[PDB]
Each structure stands twice: as structure tokens, then as C-alpha cells.
UniProtKB/Swiss-Prot annotation:
Alphabetical keyword list: ATP-binding, Cytoplasm, Magnesium, Metal-binding, Nucleotide-binding
GO cellular component: cytoplasm; type IV pilus
One GO term of the biological process aspect: type IV pilus-dependent motility
Phenotype upon gene inactivation: Deletion mutants lack surface pili.
Name of the protein in question: Type IV pilus inner membrane component PilM
Annotated ATP binding sites: 10-15, 174-175, 217, 266
Function recorded in the entry: Inner membrane component of the type IV (T4S) secretion system that plays a role in surface and host cell adhesion, colonization, biofilm maturation, virulence, and twitching, a form of surface-associated motility. PilN/PilO heterodimers form the foundation of the inner-membrane PilM/PilN/PilO/PilP complex which plays an essential role in the assembly of a functional T4 pilus. In turn, associates with PilN and facilitates PilM functionally relevant structural changes that differentially impacts PilM binding to PilB, PilT, and PilC.
GO terms of molecular function: ATP binding; metal ion binding
Localization (cell): Cytoplasm
């Protein structure tokens, strides 16, 4: 009966999500999004440990949750995910500094397929330390790619049956944008690039003489030229980026097109951004909403949650580890 907190640590904010399940129905018990100070996390690598710790503490109070066990994930250039084939029934740094986990051929039953995930131990230990500063304990250290898979299964209502489709998921962060293509529920392609919503926010800073503290993108209050000479060129830049990413996937595999394009991240909520992408690609594009078929707790604002929904895809997938191919990069004890 012990559930785990889904905690997504990005470059600009900490996202928490608590899930519960009863009678085959998921339920959002608690959630909160706490902003991180600048340069506290760079490219999903924790730089300022104390800063992340205090943000984790505040996101616990803001979410009003009493849980102390959490699921976190690692990502970046220090994280590897592969699929290796080897004989059945066997008995970045020197392995001594690498955290390794494995999980058990389709064509041939003489050999065996094994999923492999690895990273430097430092990336695990620091995240354990960050949780410790908030009084939290890591039960599962996962990989963001697999977390995206679990949250993707919750999008069957928004799409048919996700187990038969080829869907390109575009997670647009602030500094990083990730294209993940899922075939029949499993990831077959992944490509991260240095591009995100920071390009838009900074443009609003230098042109209208505003500070970094982002607020104008949500509430508004910008002059009438913003829609034409600022937001539109940025949306076109996002379109070109997504278009370029898809062309790389098509040239890498046997696929020439995808069935759907799912947008994730905070930047995915921009008005008609899904339409501009759908216009260019010619493929049905929708904003991710993993809370469509879920019940809701009383202390959770339905409106605020709906706005943050596509940005909570990673945090949602991490929280789904509370209920039973799974990876844990934590050392066995
Ligand atoms: Cl390990
Ligand atoms: Mg995000
Ligand atoms: Na809340």
C-alpha cells in the first residue's frame, strides 16, 4: 500500500506528482511545481546541491504531501540505454565508477535479449544527496526514457490502443528538447538536442526590458507586437526543430512517417503550437494529457493541473513505479 513520489528534476524547476490506484482507476493525490534558481541544474546535471535540496523541500510543502519515498531519473550524455543480444543461460569510466543495471532473442530462442542501462555513480549519489536534503529517500533511480513510456500508455484516450501505434513524442524543455519515437509502446529512437523555451523567454527579456522572472508567457500583458514579431518566430523555430528531428528518425529506420505527434514539456502549452507543427509535418499533433482518465483529490486544483499537465509527463511516469521491463540504477543492498 506504499506508493512512491514521482519527482522530476529539470534545469529550471522541480516537479512533484503523487499517484494512487483503486479499482483500476488512477488518481492524482498531490502535485506541485517549484522553480529552481538559475544554474542550479545544467543540462539535467545537478550543480548546486543545496539549491536543489531547498527547492525539493518547498515542493513538498506546496504539494501538501506526507510521503518520504520517491522515484527519480537520470538523463543526458552520461546515461546510456541499449538492447543487447547474447547467449542463453550464462552463469565512460572504469567500470568501478559506473552504475549498471540489466533486464532480460525474439527471432531465435538460442540467444537472449537484455536491456541495459548505465551511468556514472556520481549522477546517482548526488540525486540521492539532493533528496536527503529534503528528507526524502530514493527507492528507484530510473531513466527518463522509460518514464516517458509509462506515461505514454495513459494517452490511449487522447489518441485508440497505444500498443499498436508509432508515435513521436516531443518533450520540449527550457534548454533541451527530446524526440522519442515509440513503436507499440516501446522506444525505438531517441535524440536530445540543445533547444528549448528559454529562447522565447530571453527574447521577451531583451526586447521589452523585462527580467527573467517568464511570467508574461502565462498571464500576458505584453504589447500587441509580441504575437507577430516574437512569439510567431519562436513557434516557427520550434516547428523547424521538430521537423528536422523527424527527418533524422525517418532516415535512421524503416519508418517514413508516424501516426501521431505528442507534445510534452511546459513549452508545449503555447497556443496553436500544436497546429503549426501539424501544419508542417502533416501528422495529427496533440498536447499530452495523462490525467484524462484519472480521479482527482480535493486539494488539487483542476485548472492549474490541466495547465501543467504536459510538463508533468516525466514526473507521472516516475510515479507509476509505485505499481507493478523496469530499471533501477540504485546499488542493491
Ligand atoms: Cl549501481
Ligand atoms: Mg518538463
Ligand atoms: Na496542489
Amino acid at each position: 500500500a506504499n506508493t512512491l513520489l514521482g519527482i522530476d528534476i529539470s534545469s529550471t524547476s522541480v516537479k512533484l506528482l503523487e499517484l494512487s490506484r483503486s479499482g483500476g482507476r488512477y488518481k492524482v493525490e498531490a502535485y506541485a511545481v517549484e522553480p529552481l534558481p538559475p544554474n542550479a541544474v545544467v543540462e539535467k546535471n545537478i550543480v548546486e546541491l543545496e539549491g536543489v535540496g531547498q527547492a525539493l523541500s518547498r515542493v513538498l510543502v506546496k504539494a501538501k504531501t506526507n510521503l518520504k519515498s520517491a522515484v527519480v531519473a537520470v538523463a543526458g550524455s552520461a546515461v546510456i540505454t541499449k538492447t543487447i543480444e547474447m547467449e542463453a543461460g550464462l552463469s565512460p569510466y572504469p567500470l568501478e565508477e559506473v552504475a549498471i543495471d540489466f533486464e532480460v532473442s525474439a527471432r531465435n530462442p538460442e540467444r537472449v535479449d537484455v536491456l541495459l542501462a548505465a551511468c556514472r555513480k556520481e549522477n546517482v549519489e548526488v540525486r540521492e544527496a539532493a533528496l536527503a536534503l529534503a528528507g526524502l529517500t530514493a527507492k528507484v533511480v530510473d531513466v527518463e526514457a522509460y518514464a516517458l513510456e509509462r506515461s505514454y500508455a495513459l494517452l490511449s484516450s487522447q489518441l485508440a490502443d497505444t500498443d499498436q501505434l508509432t508515435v513521436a513524442v516531443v518533450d520540449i524543455g527550457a534548454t533541451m528538447t527530446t524526440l522519442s519515437v515509440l513503436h507499440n509502446g516501446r522506444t525505438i529512437y531517441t535524440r536530445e538536442q540543445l533547444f528549448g523555451g528559454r529562447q522565447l523567454t530571453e527574447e521577451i527579456q531583451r526586447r521589452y526590458g523585462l527580467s527573467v522572472e517568464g511570467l508574461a508567457k502565462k498571464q500576458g500583458g505584453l504589447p500587441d507586437d509580441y504575437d507577430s514579431e516574437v512569439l510567431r518566430p519562436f513557434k516557427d523555430a520550434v516547428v523547424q526543430q521538430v521537423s528536422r528531428s523527424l527527418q533524422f528518425f525517418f532516415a535512421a529506420g524503416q519508418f517514413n512517417d508516424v501516426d501521431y505527434i505528442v507534445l510534452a514539456g511546459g513549452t508545449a502549452s503555447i497556443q496553436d503550437l500544436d497546429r503549426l507543427i501539424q501544419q508542417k509535418i502533416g501528422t495529427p499533433t496533440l498536447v499530452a494529457n495523462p490525467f484524462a482518465d484519472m480521479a482527482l483529490n480535493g486539494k488539487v486544483n483542476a485548472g492549474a493541473l490541466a495547465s501543467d499537465a504536459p510538463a508533468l509527463m516525466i514526473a507521472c511516469g516516475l510515479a507509476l513505479r509505485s505499481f507493478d521491463a523496469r530499471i533501477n540504477l540504485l546499488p542493491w543492498r
